[PDB]
Amino acid sequence: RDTLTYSNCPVPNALLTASESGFLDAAGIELDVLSGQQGTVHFTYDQPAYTRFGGEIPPLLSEGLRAPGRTRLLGITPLLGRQGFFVRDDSPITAAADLAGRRIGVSASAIRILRGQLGDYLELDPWRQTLVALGSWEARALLHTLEHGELGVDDVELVPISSPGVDVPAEQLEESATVKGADLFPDVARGQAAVLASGDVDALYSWLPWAGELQATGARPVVDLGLDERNAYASVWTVSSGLVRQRPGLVQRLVDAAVDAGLWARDHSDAVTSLHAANLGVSTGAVGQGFGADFQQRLVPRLDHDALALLERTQQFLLTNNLLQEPVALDQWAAPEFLNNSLNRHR
Structure with missing residues (x-):
C-alpha cells in the first residue's frame, strides 16, 4: 500500500x-x-x-x-448547507433588523476582519495569519446577514468568543492518530448550544453539521444563508x-x-x-x-x-x-x- x-x-x-x-x-x-x-x-x-x-x-x-x-x-x-447566526428559539430576535444593539458572539479573528484592523497580520507568522483569515466565515456571514436588516457592523455589539475551527484549530477538532473525529466534532454543537443557552451573547455563527445539531436543540438562524449560493x-x-x-x-x-x-x-x-x-x-x-x-x-x-x-x-x-x-x-x-x-x- x-x-x-x-x-x-x-x-x-x-x-x-x-x-x-x-x-x-x-x-x-x-x-x-x-x-x-x-x-x-x-x-x-x-x-x-x-x-x-x-x-x-x-x-x-x-x-x-x-x-x-x-x-x-x-x-x-x-x-453549502445550514448556515447563519443562530439565536435561542425564544430569542426576541426574529428578523435581521432586530440584531441592532444585540451581542453577536464572534471570534477575535472575525472582529479584526469586520473592523478592518488586521494590525500585525503581514508580519505575523503563517499559522496565526491563517487563524486570522479563518475569521472570514463569520465575517462574510455577518455582513450578508446584516444586509437583510439594512444594518452595518457599527450597529451591533461584537463579543469575542471561541469559534470552532478558528480559535480551536482544526488540528484539535479532526481525527488524529489516537483520537477519532466523532470524539471531538460533536462537542462543538453542544458547546454552541451551551453558549446560547447561557444568554451571555444573543447570536453566534454555526454551519456544517454542527448547525444541524444546534438547530435540533431549538436554536434558529436569523437568516438561513444556506439558501443563497453567495455563501458557498x-x-x-x-x-x-x-x-x-x-x-x-x-x-x-x-x-x-x-x-x-x-x-x-x-x-x-x-x-x-x-x-x-x-x-x-x-x-x-x-x-x-x-x-x-x-x-x-x-x-x-x-x-x-x-x-x-x-x-x-x-x-x-x-x-x-x-x-x-x-x-x-x-x-x-x-x-x-x-x-x-x-x-x-x-x-
Whole structure:
C-alpha cells in the first residue's frame, strides 16, 4: 500500500468517501491521518506526500502568501448547507433588523476582519495569519446577514468568543492518530448550544453539521444563508507538488479512486450520509442539513470554470479584506490532467 499523510476535514468530499467505502484500498492506497496539535511546529502542506480535501482558506494562504508551489490542486467540491447566526428559539430576535444593539458572539479573528484592523497580520507568522483569515466565515456571514436588516457592523455589539475551527484549530477538532473525529466534532454543537443557552451573547455563527445539531436543540438562524449560493465555499483537494512530479502514477490512482467513489456515491446516497456522519459523530439528519440536499450526487471532483469561479470568489474576499496581497494563479495551481484522465475512463 502506498501511504499518504492526510487531514480529515468536515466537508463533503470524494476522498473520504473513497477511503471509507473501499475505493482507495482497491487502488492500493491508504491514508495516514496526521496528528498536528500544538507542539508539532511544522506546516502540514510542506509534507512530501500529504493530501487534504477541505476548506480553501488555509491552502490559499499557503499558496498565496507563505510558500507558493508547495501543493497542486486536484479538484474542487462546493460546500453549502445550514448556515447563519443562530439565536435561542425564544430569542426576541426574529428578523435581521432586530440584531441592532444585540451581542453577536464572534471570534477575535472575525472582529479584526469586520473592523478592518488586521494590525500585525503581514508580519505575523503563517499559522496565526491563517487563524486570522479563518475569521472570514463569520465575517462574510455577518455582513450578508446584516444586509437583510439594512444594518452595518457599527450597529451591533461584537463579543469575542471561541469559534470552532478558528480559535480551536482544526488540528484539535479532526481525527488524529489516537483520537477519532466523532470524539471531538460533536462537542462543538453542544458547546454552541451551551453558549446560547447561557444568554451571555444573543447570536453566534454555526454551519456544517454542527448547525444541524444546534438547530435540533431549538436554536434558529436569523437568516438561513444556506439558501443563497453567495455563501458557498469551494472545498479544495490538494496534494504535495513533489508527488505529482515524481509519482504521477500514484496521483492518477488516487484521483481515479475519488472519481469512482463520487460516481458510486450517486447510487448510494444513504451510505454516503452515514460515512460522513460516523466520522463527525453527528446524526444523519445533521449531515443532510449541514451539507445540503442531495450533496451525495455532487461529489465527483470538479475543475470546470464554475468551480474555479467559486474558488476565485473566496480569494477575492480574502483580497478585498487584505488577507491576501495578490491572487493565487488558480489555473497553474491546478493539475487538471489527473481529473481529466480519470473522467476520460468513463467517457
